Amino acid sequence: CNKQNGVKNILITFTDCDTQEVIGPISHEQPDDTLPTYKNCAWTNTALTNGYVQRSASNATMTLPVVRDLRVPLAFYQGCAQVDVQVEKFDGTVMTLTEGAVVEPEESDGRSVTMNIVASEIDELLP
């Protein structure tokens, strides 16, 4: 009742990079039991000798598999439009992503798409 590891709402606000047409927020449903993966830290460390690391700038990757909404063209899930993802988990965790961009669009069978979203920062409510 308090210890449920799962997503509850995926509110995505699409905006076309060219026409700047804001479509959203539109709730989405997961296609399977796999949960969206996150990476909040924007600095990717690398391994060096004797415990040293190289703090290099990187992105806040977010892999969000969702069922494509029939009202939304499939192109918007594959880099053709910016995504403003707002995922709230069952345990209260809410992470708002703003001005994301699908970097590596992979083939989708028309219903279940998988986004590899990239943004400068990923917020977190942390209940």
* 118 touching a second copy, by CB under 8 A: yes
- If the CB atoms of residues 12 and 100 are measured against a second copy, the closer one turns out to be 100
- If the CB atoms of residues 11 and 42 are measured against a second copy, the closer one turns out to be 42
**What's the gap between Cα 59 and its chain centre?**
12
Dist CA 84 CA 22 (whole Å): 10
* Residues 119 and 60 sit within 8 Å (Cβ to Cβ): yes
CB of 65 to a second copy, least distance (A): 11
Among 73, 68, 63, which Cα is nearest to 109's?
68
DSSP state, residue 50? G
* 71 touching a second copy, by CB under 8 A: yes
Site string for a second copy, 7-46 (x = CB under 8 A): -x------x-x-----------xxxxxxxxxxxxxxxxxx
Site string for a second copy, 41-70 (x = CB under 8 A): xxxxxxxxxxxxxxxxxxxxxxx---x--x
Helix (H, G, I), strand (E, B) or coil at 4: coil
Window 77 to 116, contacts with a second copy (CB under 8 A)? 78-82, 89-93, 95, 99-111, 116
94-96 vs 81-89, strand pairing mode = antiparallel
- If the CB atoms of residues 12 and 118 are measured against a second copy, the closer one turns out to be 118
Tell me which residue has tokens 């995505």. Answer: 12
